[PDB]
Tab-separated table of C-alpha atoms in Angstrom:
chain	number	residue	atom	x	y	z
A	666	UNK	CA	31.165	29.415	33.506
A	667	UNK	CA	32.164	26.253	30.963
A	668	UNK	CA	31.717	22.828	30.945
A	669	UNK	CA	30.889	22.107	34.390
A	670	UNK	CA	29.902	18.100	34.870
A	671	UNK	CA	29.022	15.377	37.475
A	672	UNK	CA	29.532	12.061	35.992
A	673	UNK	CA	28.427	9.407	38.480
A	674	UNK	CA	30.804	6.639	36.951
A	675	UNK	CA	32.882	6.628	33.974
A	676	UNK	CA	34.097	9.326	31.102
A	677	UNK	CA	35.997	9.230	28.013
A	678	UNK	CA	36.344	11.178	24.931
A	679	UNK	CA	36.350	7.813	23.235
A	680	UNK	CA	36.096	4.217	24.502
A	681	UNK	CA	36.550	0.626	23.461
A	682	UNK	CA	36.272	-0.702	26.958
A	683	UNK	CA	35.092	-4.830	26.880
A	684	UNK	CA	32.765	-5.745	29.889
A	685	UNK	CA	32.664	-9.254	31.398
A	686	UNK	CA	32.737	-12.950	29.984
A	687	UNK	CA	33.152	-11.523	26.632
A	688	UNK	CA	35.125	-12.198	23.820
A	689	UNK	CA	36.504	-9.452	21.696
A	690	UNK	CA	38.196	-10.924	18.657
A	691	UNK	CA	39.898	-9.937	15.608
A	692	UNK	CA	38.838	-6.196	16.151
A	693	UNK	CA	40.450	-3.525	14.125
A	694	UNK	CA	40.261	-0.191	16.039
A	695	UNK	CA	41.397	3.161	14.588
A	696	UNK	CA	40.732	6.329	15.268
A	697	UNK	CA	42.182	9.976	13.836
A	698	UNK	CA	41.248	12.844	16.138
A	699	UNK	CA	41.692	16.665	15.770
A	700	UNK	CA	40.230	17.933	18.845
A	701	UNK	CA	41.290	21.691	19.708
A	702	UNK	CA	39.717	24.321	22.379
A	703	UNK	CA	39.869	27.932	22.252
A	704	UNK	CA	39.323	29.839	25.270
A	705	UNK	CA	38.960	33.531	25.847
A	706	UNK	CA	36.919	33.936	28.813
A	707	UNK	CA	36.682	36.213	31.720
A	708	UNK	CA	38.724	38.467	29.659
A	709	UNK	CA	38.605	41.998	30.401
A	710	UNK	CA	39.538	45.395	28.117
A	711	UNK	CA	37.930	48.907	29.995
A	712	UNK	CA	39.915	52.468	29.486
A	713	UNK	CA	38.871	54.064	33.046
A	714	UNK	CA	36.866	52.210	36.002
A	715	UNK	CA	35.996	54.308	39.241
A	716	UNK	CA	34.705	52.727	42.677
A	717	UNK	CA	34.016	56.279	44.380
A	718	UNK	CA	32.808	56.565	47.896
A	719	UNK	CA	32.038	60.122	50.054
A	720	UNK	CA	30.568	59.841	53.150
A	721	UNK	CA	29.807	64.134	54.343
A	722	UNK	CA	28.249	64.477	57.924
A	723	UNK	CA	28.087	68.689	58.000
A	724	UNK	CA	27.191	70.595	61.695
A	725	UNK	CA	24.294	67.579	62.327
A	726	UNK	CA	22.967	65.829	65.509
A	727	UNK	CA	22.964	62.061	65.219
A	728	UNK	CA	21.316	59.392	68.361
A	729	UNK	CA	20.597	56.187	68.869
A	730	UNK	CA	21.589	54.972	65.113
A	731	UNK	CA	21.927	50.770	65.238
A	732	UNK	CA	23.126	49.749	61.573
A	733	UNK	CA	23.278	45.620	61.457
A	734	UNK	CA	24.246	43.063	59.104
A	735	UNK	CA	22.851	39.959	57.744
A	736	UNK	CA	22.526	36.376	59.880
A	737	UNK	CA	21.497	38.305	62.960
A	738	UNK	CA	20.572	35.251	65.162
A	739	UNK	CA	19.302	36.705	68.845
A	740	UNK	CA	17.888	34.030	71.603
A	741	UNK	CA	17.392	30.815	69.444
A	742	UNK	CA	17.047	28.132	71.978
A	743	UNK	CA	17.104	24.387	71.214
A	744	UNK	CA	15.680	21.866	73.221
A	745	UNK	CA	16.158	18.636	72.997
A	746	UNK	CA	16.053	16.032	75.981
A	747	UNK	CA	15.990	12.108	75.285
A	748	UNK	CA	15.011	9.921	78.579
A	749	UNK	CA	14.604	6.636	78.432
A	750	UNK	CA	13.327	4.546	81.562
A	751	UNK	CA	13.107	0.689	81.872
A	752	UNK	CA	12.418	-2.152	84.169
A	753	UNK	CA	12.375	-6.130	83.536
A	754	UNK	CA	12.637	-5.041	79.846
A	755	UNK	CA	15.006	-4.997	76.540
A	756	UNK	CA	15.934	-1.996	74.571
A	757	UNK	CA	17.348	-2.607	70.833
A	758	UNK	CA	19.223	0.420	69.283
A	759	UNK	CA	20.751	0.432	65.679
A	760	UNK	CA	21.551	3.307	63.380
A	761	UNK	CA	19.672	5.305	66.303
A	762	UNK	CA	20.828	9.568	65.295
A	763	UNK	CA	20.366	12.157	66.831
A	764	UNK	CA	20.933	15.251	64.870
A	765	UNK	CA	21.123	19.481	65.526
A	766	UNK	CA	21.996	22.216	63.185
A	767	UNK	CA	24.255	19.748	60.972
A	768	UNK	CA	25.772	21.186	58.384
A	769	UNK	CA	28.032	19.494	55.196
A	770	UNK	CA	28.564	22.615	52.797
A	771	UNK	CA	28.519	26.544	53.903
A	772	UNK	CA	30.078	29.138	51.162
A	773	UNK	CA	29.232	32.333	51.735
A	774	UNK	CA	30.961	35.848	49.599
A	775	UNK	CA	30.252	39.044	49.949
A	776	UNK	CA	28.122	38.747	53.283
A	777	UNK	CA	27.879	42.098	53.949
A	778	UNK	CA	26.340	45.822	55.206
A	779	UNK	CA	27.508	47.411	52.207
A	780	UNK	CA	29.191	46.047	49.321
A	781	UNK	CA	30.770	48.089	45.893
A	782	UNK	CA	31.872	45.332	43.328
A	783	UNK	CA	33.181	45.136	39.681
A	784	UNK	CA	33.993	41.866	37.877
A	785	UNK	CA	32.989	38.194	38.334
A	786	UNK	CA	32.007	35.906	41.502
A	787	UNK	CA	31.531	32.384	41.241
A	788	UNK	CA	30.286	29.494	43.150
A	789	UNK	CA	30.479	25.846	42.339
A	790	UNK	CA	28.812	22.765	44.549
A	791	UNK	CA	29.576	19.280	43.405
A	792	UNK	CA	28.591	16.296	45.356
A	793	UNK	CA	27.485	12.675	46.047
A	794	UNK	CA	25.535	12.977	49.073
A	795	UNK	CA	24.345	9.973	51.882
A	796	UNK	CA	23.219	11.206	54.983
A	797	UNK	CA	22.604	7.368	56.406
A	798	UNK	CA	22.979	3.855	55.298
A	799	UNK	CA	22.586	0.891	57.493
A	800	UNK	CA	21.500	-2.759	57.246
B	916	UNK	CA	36.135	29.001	35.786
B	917	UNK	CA	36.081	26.228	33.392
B	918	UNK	CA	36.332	22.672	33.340
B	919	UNK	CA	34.848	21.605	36.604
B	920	UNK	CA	34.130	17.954	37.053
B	921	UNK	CA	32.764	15.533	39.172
B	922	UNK	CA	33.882	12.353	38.039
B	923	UNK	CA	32.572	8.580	39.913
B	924	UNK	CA	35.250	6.164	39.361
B	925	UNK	CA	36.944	6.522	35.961
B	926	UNK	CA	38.401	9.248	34.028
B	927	UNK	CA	40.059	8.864	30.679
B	928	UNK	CA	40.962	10.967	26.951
B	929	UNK	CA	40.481	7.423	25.161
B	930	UNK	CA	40.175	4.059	27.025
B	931	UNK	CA	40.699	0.695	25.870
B	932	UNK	CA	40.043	-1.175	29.685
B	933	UNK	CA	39.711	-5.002	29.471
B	934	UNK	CA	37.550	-5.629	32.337
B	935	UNK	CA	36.771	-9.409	33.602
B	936	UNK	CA	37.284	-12.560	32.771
B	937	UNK	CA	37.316	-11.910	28.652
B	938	UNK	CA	39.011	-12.855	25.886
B	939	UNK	CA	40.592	-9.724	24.191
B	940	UNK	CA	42.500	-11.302	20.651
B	941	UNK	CA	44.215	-10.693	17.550
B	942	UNK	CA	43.099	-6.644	18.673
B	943	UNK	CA	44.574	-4.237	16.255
B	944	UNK	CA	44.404	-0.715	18.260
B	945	UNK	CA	45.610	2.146	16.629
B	946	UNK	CA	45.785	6.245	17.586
B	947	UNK	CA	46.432	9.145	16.288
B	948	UNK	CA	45.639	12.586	18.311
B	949	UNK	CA	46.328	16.230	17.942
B	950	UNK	CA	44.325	17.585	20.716
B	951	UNK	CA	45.470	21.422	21.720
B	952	UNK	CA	44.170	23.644	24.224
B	953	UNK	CA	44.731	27.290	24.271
B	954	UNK	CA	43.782	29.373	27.537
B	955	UNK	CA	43.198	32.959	27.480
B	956	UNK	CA	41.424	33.234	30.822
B	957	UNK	CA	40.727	35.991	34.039
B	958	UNK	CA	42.805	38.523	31.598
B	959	UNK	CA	42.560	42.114	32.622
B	960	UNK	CA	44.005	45.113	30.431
B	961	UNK	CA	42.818	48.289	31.836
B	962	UNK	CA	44.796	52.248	31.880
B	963	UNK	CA	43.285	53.433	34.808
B	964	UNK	CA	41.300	52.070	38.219
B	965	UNK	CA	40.241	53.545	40.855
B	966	UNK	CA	39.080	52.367	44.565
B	967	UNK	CA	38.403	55.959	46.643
B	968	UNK	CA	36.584	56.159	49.886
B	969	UNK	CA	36.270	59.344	51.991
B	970	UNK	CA	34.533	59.915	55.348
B	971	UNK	CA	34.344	63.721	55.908
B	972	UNK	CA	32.886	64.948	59.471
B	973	UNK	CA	32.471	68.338	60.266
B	974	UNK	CA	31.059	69.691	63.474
B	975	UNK	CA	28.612	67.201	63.787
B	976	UNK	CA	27.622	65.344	66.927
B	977	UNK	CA	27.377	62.166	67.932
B	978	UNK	CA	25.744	59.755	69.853
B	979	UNK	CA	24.959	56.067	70.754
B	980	UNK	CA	26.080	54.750	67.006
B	981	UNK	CA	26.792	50.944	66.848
B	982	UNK	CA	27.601	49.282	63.554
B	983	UNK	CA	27.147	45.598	63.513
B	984	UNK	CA	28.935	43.249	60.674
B	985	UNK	CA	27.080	40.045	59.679
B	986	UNK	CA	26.651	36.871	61.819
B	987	UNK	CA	26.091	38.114	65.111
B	988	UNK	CA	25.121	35.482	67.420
B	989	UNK	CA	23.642	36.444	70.388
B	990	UNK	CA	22.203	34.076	73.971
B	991	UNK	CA	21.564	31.319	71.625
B	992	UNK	CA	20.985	27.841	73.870
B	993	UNK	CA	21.234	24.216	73.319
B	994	UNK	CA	19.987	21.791	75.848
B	995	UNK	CA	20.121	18.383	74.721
B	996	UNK	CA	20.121	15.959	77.935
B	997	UNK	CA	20.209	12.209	77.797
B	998	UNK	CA	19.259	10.006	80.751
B	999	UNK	CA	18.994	6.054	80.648
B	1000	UNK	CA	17.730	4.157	84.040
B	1001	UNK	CA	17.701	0.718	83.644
B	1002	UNK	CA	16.781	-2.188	86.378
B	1003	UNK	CA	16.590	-5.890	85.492
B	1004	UNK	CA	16.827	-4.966	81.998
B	1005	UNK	CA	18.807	-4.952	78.712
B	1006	UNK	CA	20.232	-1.754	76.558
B	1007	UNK	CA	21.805	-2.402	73.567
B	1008	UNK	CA	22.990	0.094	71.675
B	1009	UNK	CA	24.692	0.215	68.445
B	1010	UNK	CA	25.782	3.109	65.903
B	1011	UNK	CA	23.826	5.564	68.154
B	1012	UNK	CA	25.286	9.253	67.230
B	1013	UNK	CA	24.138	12.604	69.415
B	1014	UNK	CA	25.527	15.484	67.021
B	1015	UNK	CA	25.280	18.986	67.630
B	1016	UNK	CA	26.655	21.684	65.471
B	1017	UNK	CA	28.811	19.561	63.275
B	1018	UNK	CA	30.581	21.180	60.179
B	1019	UNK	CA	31.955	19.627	57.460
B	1020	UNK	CA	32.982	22.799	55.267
B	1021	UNK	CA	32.778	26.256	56.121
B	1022	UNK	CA	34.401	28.347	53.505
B	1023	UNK	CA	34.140	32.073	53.841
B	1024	UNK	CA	35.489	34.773	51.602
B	1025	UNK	CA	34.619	38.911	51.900
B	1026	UNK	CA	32.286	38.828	54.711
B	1027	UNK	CA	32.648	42.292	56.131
B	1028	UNK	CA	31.161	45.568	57.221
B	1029	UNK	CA	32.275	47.140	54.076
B	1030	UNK	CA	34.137	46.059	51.041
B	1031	UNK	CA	34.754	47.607	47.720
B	1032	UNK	CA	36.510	45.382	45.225
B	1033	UNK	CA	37.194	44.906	41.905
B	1034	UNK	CA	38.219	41.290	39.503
B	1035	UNK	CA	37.335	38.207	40.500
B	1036	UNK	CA	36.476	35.885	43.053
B	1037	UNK	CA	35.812	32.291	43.530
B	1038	UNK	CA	34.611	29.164	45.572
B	1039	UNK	CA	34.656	25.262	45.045
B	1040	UNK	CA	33.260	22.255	46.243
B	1041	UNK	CA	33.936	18.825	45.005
B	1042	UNK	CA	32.836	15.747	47.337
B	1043	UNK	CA	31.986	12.398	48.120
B	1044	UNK	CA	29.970	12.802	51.923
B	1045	UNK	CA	28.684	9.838	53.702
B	1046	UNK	CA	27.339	10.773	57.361
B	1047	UNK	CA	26.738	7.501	58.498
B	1048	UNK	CA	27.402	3.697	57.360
B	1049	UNK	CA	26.832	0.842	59.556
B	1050	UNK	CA	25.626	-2.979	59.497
C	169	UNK	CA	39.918	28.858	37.248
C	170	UNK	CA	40.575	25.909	34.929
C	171	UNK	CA	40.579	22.427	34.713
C	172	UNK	CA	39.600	21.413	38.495
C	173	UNK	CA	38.723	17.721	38.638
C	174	UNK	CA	37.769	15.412	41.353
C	175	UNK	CA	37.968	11.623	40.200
C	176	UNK	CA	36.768	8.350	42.538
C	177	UNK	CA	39.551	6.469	41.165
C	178	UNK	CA	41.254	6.412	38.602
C	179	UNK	CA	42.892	8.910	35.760
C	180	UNK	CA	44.478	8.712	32.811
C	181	UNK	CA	44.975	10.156	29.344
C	182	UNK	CA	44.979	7.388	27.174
C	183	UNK	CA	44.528	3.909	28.991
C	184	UNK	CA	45.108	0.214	28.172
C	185	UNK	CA	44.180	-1.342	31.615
C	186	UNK	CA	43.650	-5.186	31.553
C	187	UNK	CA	41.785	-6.037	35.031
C	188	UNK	CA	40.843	-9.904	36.544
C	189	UNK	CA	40.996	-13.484	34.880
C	190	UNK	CA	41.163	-12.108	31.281
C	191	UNK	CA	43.086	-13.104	28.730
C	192	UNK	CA	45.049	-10.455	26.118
C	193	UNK	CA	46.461	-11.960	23.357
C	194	UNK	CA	48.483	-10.960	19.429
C	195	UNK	CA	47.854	-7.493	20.645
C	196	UNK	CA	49.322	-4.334	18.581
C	197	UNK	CA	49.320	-0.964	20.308
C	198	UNK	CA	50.138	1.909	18.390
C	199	UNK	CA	49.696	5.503	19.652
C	200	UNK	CA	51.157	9.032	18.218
C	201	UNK	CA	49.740	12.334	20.472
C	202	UNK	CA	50.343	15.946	20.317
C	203	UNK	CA	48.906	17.588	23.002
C	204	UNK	CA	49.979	21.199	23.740
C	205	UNK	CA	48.091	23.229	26.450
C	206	UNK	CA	48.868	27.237	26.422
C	207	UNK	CA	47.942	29.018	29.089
C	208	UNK	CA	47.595	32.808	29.726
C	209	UNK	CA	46.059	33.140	32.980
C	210	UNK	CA	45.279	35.526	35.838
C	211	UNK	CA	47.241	38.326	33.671
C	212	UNK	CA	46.897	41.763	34.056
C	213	UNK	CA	48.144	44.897	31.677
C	214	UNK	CA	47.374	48.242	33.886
C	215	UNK	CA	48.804	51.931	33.515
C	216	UNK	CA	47.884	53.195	36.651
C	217	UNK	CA	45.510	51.425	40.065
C	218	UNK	CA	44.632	53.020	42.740
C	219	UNK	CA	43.460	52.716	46.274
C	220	UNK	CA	42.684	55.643	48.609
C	221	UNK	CA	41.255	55.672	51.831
C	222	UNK	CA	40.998	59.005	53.689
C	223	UNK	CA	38.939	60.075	57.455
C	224	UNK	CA	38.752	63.524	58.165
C	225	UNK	CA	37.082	64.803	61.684
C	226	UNK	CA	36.653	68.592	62.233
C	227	UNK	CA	35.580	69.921	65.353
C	228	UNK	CA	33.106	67.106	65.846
C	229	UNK	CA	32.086	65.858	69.030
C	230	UNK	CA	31.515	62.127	68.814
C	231	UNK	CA	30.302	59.554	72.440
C	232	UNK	CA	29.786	55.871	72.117
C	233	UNK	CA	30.630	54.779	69.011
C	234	UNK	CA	30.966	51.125	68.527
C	235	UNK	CA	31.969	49.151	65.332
C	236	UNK	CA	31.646	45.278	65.644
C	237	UNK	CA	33.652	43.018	63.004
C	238	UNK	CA	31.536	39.853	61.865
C	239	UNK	CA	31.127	36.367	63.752
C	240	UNK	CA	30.340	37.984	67.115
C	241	UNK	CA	29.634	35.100	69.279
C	242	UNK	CA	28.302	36.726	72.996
C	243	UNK	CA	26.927	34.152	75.749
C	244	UNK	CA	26.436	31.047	73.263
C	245	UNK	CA	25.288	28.326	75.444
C	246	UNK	CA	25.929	24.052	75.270
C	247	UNK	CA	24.576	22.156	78.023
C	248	UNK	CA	24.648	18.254	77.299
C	249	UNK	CA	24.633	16.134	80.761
C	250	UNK	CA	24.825	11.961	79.948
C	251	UNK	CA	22.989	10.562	82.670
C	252	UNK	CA	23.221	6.389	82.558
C	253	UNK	CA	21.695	4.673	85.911
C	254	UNK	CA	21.727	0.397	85.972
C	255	UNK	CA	20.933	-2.066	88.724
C	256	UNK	CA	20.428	-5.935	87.972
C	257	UNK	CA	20.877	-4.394	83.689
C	258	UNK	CA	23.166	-5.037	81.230
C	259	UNK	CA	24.349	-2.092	79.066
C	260	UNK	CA	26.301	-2.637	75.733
C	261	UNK	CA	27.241	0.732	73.896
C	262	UNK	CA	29.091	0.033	69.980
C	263	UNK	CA	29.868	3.055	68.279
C	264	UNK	CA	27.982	5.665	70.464
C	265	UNK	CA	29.247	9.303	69.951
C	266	UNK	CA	28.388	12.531	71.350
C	267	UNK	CA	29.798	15.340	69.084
C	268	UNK	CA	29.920	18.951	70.320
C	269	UNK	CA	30.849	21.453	67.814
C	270	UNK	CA	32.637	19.639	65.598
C	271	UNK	CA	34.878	21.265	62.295
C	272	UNK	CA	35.764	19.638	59.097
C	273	UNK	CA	37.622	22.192	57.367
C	274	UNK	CA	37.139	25.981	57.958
C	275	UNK	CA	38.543	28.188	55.682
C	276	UNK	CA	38.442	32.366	55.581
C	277	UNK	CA	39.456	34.723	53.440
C	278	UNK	CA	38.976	38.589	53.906
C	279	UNK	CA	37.030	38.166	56.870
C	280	UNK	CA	37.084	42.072	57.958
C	281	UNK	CA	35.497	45.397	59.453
C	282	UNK	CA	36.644	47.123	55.968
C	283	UNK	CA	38.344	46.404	53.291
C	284	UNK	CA	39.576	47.251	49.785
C	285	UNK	CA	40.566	44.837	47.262
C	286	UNK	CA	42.172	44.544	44.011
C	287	UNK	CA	42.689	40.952	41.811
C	288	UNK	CA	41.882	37.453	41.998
C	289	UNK	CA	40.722	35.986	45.083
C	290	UNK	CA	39.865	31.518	45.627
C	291	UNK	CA	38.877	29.008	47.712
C	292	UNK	CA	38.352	25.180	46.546
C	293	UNK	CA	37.867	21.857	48.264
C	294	UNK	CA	38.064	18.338	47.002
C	295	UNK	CA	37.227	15.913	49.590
C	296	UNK	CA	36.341	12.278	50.423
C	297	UNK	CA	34.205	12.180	53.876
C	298	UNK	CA	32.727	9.680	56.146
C	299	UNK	CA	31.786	10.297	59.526
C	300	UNK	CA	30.994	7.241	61.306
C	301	UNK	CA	31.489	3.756	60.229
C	302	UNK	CA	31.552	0.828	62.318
C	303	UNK	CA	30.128	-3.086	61.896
């Protein structure tokens, strides 16, 4: 990949940018820019490309074959019991979380048993993340 | 891909911002850009492709065959119970979140038993993500 | 892909933004762009593609077969009882949630038992997300 960026704030190519309780005065600002991009990416020249796939079973006996992916999940069990019990008293709660198999982001390609692949894949994560902020 | 970006706020070619109570005077600004892009990009040239699968059974036999694809989720259990008993007493309770399984994205692409492909594939993610804020 | 861009606020090519309390004064602006952008993209040049997909069966003798696509979900389980008992008690509850299996955005592409593919295939997500926020 190309130019892949995480600016937290501000970009320019160029900048003259004037802050606070300044004075900017009399300035002479000029600027001549050649600024050209030439791309040839990903680009692909092939003749002949074969994605061959024979499967022969002849006079055979086959039993009990189990084949079986990824991200088999079998009998998870979570558990998670909140009890709370008061007399003649004061309970206070702020910002209180309580938080099971959360999930921001999930990409997932070619999740698979069997897979035959020509080319390019590609995955791109940008991100400013809080989980919590309180106050 | 190219040209992936994550940008905070502010996003310029050239930038000339006057932010806060300043004085900006007399300011001669002058500009002059030639600024070309040329793209030649996921281009293919190619005479001859191919995808060819074949499954051939003769006289075989079969039995008890089970082919499972990817995330299989199987007697999986959450138990997550909340009890309050209050007498003579006080709850107070602000911002308080039970979360269970919560998504934000899911993005799938080619999840399969079996694929055969050719060119290209692709995923993105660009984000600002707060869980919780509060005061 | 190209040029994919997620900005917090604000975007512009060339930019003379004057913000709060300032003053801008005998000013002279001058600005002379060429900007061209060419694009070739995602173009394909083939003679001849192709996709074959043959099953023969002879004089086979086949008994319990099973093929099972992806994201099999079998006896998933969500118990979450909310038990609140008060006598004589005060209860205040501000921005309590209980969140079950909860989806943003959930996006699939080529989500098969088998398949055979050919080209350009994407996903992408830009996003601004917050949860909870209460005060």
């Amino acid at each position: 990949s190309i130019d892949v960026k995480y600016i937290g704030v501000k970009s320019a190519y160029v900048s003259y940018d004037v802050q606070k309780r300044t004075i900017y005065l009399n300035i002479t600002n000029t600027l001549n820019i050649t600024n050209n991009n030439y791309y040839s990416v990903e680009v692909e020249n092939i003749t002949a490309q074969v994605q061959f796939s024979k499967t022969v079973i002849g006079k055979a006996r086959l039993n009990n074959i189990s084949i079986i992916g990824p991200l088999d999940m079998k009998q998870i069990d979570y558990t998670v019991p909140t009890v709370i019990a008061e007399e003649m008293s004061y309970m206070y709660d702020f910002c209180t979380l309580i938080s099971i198999k959360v999930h921001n982001i999930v990409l997932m390609m070619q999740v698979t048993v069997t897979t035959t692949y020509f080319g390019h894949s590609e995955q791109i994560s940008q991100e400013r993340y809080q989980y919590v902020d309180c106050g």
